[PDB]
């Protein structure tokens, strides 16, 4: 509306602002933030690590993979599925598998067995 100058959401945080000089409604998005997790095999085994930026799209951030949990750097995606070793997020687990590197995969629920009814 003409008299309104700011905009607030249900959480009482500013979401839009009217530019004082030219009347234009500019939406405000909070600058990207997210937790950083270090996926590590035991330091007894290796010193290589992967880094998961949780909830951060891979644009904002030597293999880069985008999963629902966030952006994963340092783990290679493998199509084959194994039992979960290090949980990462929405169905993706990491493991240290043989060179010899850190792989990320969709975890396998179990062996498929069809009973002969």
């Amino acid at each position: 509306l003409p008299f309104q100058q700011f905009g607030r959401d249900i959480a009482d945080t500013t979401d839009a602002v009217r530019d004082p000089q030219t009347l234009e409604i500019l939406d405000i998005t909070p600058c990207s933030f997210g937790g950083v997790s270090v996926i590590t095999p035991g330091t007894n085994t290796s010193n290589q690590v992967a880094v998961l930026y949780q909830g951060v799209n891979c644009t904002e951030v030597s293999n880069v993979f985008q999963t629902r949990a966030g952006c994963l750097i340092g783990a290679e995606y493998v199509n084959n599925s194994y039992e979960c070793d290090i949980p990462i997020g929405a169905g993706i687990c990491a493991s240290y598998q043989t060179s010899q590197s850190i792989i990320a995969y969709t975890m396998s629920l179990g062996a498929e067995n069809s009973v002969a009814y």
């Binding site: 009482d12 909830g55 979960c84 997020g89 975890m107 069809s114 009973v115 009814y117």
Partner: protein, 407 residues
């Protein structure tokens, strides 16, 4: 009365619904971002306050791991993924509503789809962590449990899955509840129709009353409320001059600004501590519910339970799990006696000077003749030496009646 018994002459197959929460939303907090935002002056004092931030982070991480563990405890009981046979004929019993629907892109059963539709379930340092197991994986666990129950009965729970025709499984479940196999085999079509009608009514019953799913919704609502409250708590002044830290820093001198920043830090740290304690209590409640759900999955779905009212209302026959957003819905198929009839009963039959007691069942008189019947169903048979044991004399027993025992 001394001599009055009531024996059922029919049965009803009733399917009931039990909704149980399993997991709650996993949340993470950045203590510095919440309390101080981007202000370094606030961060320096927060460093002085102590190790409260690490304690809160550890508590929230433990809660998240606990939620994941609850989900695995409830759903990951099956060692192998079982698939229903391609030809879905199961003796006239119709599992289309509970079995996965390939046409649906989500690969979910109609009841699961309705549950997902019914319950549909700010950024100031607060993040929501996705669950380890996606809804598709929980659906696959549920489908595996259903396939194991349908094809193998309870054998897959206690060891290798063993094939069995579904009518035989129902007959053995009737034997479990105390009813002979002939009752199932003679009345197979009626029982199949009753089960089909009850399964059909389950969907309409769930759709009609949203409050049935309210528990799950309540869980979600609670989480939202908590998070919302926390965000609104940033608008509070907590005794300081203003909520915004930049305004305090610019308006006042540094030494005076220290006390205002300290008040804001104390208020926001107290708010975060209250939030963490509340979610610790809620996580304890959800863990209790998830343990109950795991026990039900082990006892109602993977076996037949003799515990009264643990698996539905009535005599438990079987159970079927269904996934729901942040919870599990158990469909309990139970046996309910119906159409009772009055009869005259006696403790023992006196013949040739000897008492006779029934091996199974009780003695029943239709006014002129005496029979032996099973307890939960009226199937009268002639009193014979095969279904009676003598064990005593005629004088001691109170209420004994004289009648013949054929051989």
């Amino acid at each position: 009365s001394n001599n009055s018994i009531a024996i059922p002459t029919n049965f009803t197959i009733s399917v009931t619904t039990e909704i149980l929460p399993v997991s709650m939303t996993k949340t993470s907090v950045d203590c510095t971002m919440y309390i101080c935002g981007d202000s370094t002056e606030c961060s320096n004092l927060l460093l002085q306050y102590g190790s409260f931030c690490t304690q809160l982070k550890r508590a929230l991480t433990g809660i998240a791991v606990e939620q994941d563990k609850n989900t695995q405890e409830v759903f990951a009981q099956v060692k192998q993924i079982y698939k229903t046979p391609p030809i879905k004929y199961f003796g006239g019993f119709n599992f289309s509503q509970i079995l996965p629907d390939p046409s649906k892109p989500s690969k979910r059963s109609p009841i699961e789809d309705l549950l997902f539709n019914k319950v549909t379930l700010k950024f100031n340092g607060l993040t929501v962590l996705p669950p380890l197991l996606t809804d598709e994986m929980i659906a696959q666990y549920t489908s595996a449990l259903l396939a194991g129950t349908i094809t193998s009965g309870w054998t897959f729970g206690a060891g290798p899955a063993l094939q069995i025709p579904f009518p035989m499984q129902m007959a053995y479940r009737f034997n479990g509840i105390g009813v002979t196999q002939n009752v199932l085999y003679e009345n197979q079509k009626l029982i199949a129709n009753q089960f089909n009608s009850a399964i059909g009514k389950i969907q309409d019953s769930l759709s009609s009353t949203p409050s049935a799913l309210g528990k799950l919704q309540d869980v979600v609502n609670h989480n939202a409320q908590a998070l919302n409250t926390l965000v609104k708590q940033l608008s509070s002044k907590f005794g300081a001059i203003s909520s915004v830290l930049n305004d305090i820093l610019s308006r006042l001198d540094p030494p005076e600004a220290e006390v205002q920043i300290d008040r804001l830090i104390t208020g926001r740290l107290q708010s975060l501590q209250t939030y963490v304690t509340q979610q610790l209590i809620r996580a304890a409640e959800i863990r209790a519910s998830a343990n109950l759900a795991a026990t039900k999955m082990s006892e109602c779905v993977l076996g037949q339970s003799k515990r009264v009212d643990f698996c539905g209302k009535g005599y438990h026959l079987m159970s079927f799990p269904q996934s729901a957003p942040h919870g599990v819905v158990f469909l309990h198929v139970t046996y309910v006696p119906a159409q009772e009839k009055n009869f005259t009963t006696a403790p023992a039959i006196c013949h040739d000077g000897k008492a006779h007691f029934p091996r199974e069942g009780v003695f029943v008189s239709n006014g002129t003749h005496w029979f032996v019947t099973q307890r939960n169903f009226y199937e009268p048979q002639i009193i014979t030496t095969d279904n009676t044991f003598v064990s005593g004399n005629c004088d001691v027993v109170i209420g004994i009646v004289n009648n013949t025992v054929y051989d």
